[PDB]
């Protein structure tokens, strides 16, 4: 009795894994080694962003199986492989239980280049949409009850750091704890602060002695907020301990980051020392030039440090902790190194949807 | 009560609304599908995006033209609605579901609908007008 009708322009979407253009805000005259990449990969930004708040609808935001993270990761590898040319690069190839292989020995000219992060947006093409969840108490996974279609994202600074998140984006109401599976003893725990912690970090006018000052009272109250939120998941009566590290490579056992083009390695044993029950800290950073690469596996030699003062002030906004579950009290040790987890704390609430405005529905037409 | 007219919920703004009201705001989810070193980098990619959007819109309009609805947004056809495709009461389908729930539900049986709307209209209304 009732017949099939077509519809062009229905508001439905599906889940897709398409590519995106960056569209950062470049300058096209500066040789900071980020504008050079941005003027070879990005278009300029539109100064009037489009934001549409949606009606009574929910969507399932997954965050540990995202697609924007692995598209961030390739772009940042391309940027780092273009900008910081290593002096000597060693990579093991050996395309074929024991297979013998040597290492490649790629050499190139390695001049000194300036380095500074810039905010990089990620802007979806025509025929797609980006959904953003605005719930201030987001678990990280599961459904979200308030979505909004944005044209594209906030200012993401592609920082490269381990054991501390630098120049990141803050939280809304309280400090937040995100994990793929809690009580699993192997997944990294991401901690997002509610207020930034300012850190000065500099080598003043041997040459590989840089100090790195952080305020003690703000760090104490930040760690108090952190342990107060970790005690919500652990029975409200357990003792929480903080330790330094456990072995490993030099780039993961310490706060390994970059400043002015120099590879700073700051010790963090003077930070994670308190045990919790129910003025300025100086750090001995070394500027290192025989490092393990994070883009692939292998070693890289760089130049000796340039003369002059090297100063950088930043905002610590996030932590990467890891439980040491055993056989009582619980001890958290830091870590990280898998650089996707650096960008999985800033693309933590976005989803890419494919528009599909072609529906069918039955009603009482004829012919 | 008193009224003043319509409002503009925006692009993709009526996803949470019922299908009885989202089918009236069809014109704003359809209009938005069309919308020297600096020249050779920032010019090629934007032109490629514009050409891809134009080609996608022309492909959708070609598919509608094959389906028998040349330029109409809402258009209605000759294929009967088989009851094996899940039917409910008319008030329930046109007043109690979003478009998202309907598209999540019917997605098992969409290609058979598309093939039937091609063949049983435009190979059956035609070949009888050529007699």
């Amino acid at each position, epitope marked *: 009795n009732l017949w099939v009708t077509v519809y062009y322009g229905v508001p439905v979407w599906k889940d897709a894994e398409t590519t995106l253009f960056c569209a950062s805000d470049a300058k096209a005259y500066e040789t900071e080694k980020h504008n050079v990449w941005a003027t070879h990969a990005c278009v300029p930004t539109d100064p009037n962003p489009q934001e549409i708040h949606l009606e009574n609808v929910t969507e399932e935001f997954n965050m540990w199986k995202n697609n924007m993270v692995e598209q961030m990761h390739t772009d940042i590898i391309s940027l780092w492989d273009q900008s910081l040319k290593p002096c000597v690069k060693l990579t093991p190839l050996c395309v074929t239980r024991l297979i013998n292989c040597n290492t490649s020995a790629i050499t190139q000219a390695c001049p000194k280049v300036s380095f500074e992060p810039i905010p990089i947006h990620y802007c979806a093409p025509a025929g797609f949409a980006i959904l953003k969840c*605005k719930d201030k108490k987001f678990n990280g996974t599961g459904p979200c009850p308030s979505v909004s279609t944005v044209q594209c994202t906030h200012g993401i600074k592609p920082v490269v750091s381990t054991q501390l998140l630098l120049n990141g984006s803050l939280a809304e109401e309280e400090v937040m704890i995100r994990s793929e599976n809690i009580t699993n003893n192997a997944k990294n725990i991401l901690v997002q602060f509610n207020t930034p912690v300012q850190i000065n970090c500099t080598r003043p006018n041997d040459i590989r002695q840089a100090h790195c000052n952080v305020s003690k009272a703000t760090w104490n109250e930040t760690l108090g907020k952190v342990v107060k939120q970790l005690r919500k998941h652990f029975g409200n009566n357990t003792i929480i301990r903080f330790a330094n590290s456990s072995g490993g490579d030099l780039e993961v056992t310490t706060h390994s980051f970059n400043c002015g083009g120099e590879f700073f390695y700051c010790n963090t044993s003077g930070l994670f020392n308190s045990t919790w029950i129910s003025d300025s800290i100086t750090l001995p950073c070394r500027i290192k030039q025989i490092i393990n690469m994070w883009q692939r596996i292998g070693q890289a030699m760089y130049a000796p440090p340039i003369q002059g003062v090297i100063r950088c002030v930043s905002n610590i906004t996030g932590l990467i902790l890891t439980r040491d579950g055993g056989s009582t009290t619980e001890t958290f040790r830091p870590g990280g190194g898998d650089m996707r987890d650096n960008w999985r704390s800033e693309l933590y609430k976005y989803k890419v949807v494919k528009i599909e405005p072609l529906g069918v529905a039955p009603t009482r037409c004829k012919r | 009560a*008193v*009224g003043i*007219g*319509a*409002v*503009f919920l925006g692009f993709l703004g009526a996803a949470g609304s019922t299908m009885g*009201a989202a089918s009236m705001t069809l014109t704003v989810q359809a209009r938005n599908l069309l919308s020297l070193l600096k020249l050779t980098v920032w010019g090629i990619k934007q032109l490629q995006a514009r050409v891809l959007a134009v080609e996608r819109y022309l492909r959708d309009q070609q598919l509608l033209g094959i389906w028998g609805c040349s330029g109409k947004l809402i258009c209605c056809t000759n294929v009967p609605w088989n009851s094996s495709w899940s039917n409910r009461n008319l008030s329930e389908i046109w007043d109690n579901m979003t478009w998202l729930q309907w598209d999540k539900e019917i997605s098992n049986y969409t290609q058979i609908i598309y093939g039937l709307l091609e063949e049983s209209q435009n190979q059956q209304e035609k070949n009888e007008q050529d007699l």
Partner: antibody
Amino acid sequence: QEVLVQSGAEVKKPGASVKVSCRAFGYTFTGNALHWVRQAPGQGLEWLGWINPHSGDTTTSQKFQGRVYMTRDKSINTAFLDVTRLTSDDTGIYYCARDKYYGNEAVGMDVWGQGTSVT
Amino acid sequence: DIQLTQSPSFLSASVGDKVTITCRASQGVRNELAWYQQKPGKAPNLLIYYASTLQSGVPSRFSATGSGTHFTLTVSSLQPEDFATYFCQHMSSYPLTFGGGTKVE
């Protein structure tokens, strides 16, 4: 999250005109009509008029015809109320409100501004 | 216009009681009623729309019934933060107007 922010308080001489603004945060501005109500101190609320932020059509009460005027701006997402030829009875609190606006008629106002006091 | 009368204007009650406040209109208004409450120094908020439907956010202890020119707002259990001033607003035709204000203590 869905809030309305108004402007500060004002004190004006009688017979003058006063301008008050209401801005909408957390929801799309061109989707719901805006109502204006006033309370005099000591008694209940009284109503002024309501405006569509998309078309620009207005609706004003019969008591204040030619007295109050309602305009809009979409780049800032603001609504302006102008009250002309002030008297001593106009001392009170102004309120902008978001009407729920279900089925394209008036249903009920749910989001309110913090208020603007005039004397 | 259409006049709205609330009975009683003033009432005194204790915690845990049952109260009913009657809103009355001069003409038929079908069901287009809105019930609000307000604390002094604060903006009002919506409680009942369409004279029977609970707003998402208010507790379920409140209820509202009525038709024609006779309407009742009923509180099943009186809580100490619910002691406010209660308004009923019709929206049948222009002009819109409020009630007299029912203050409880």
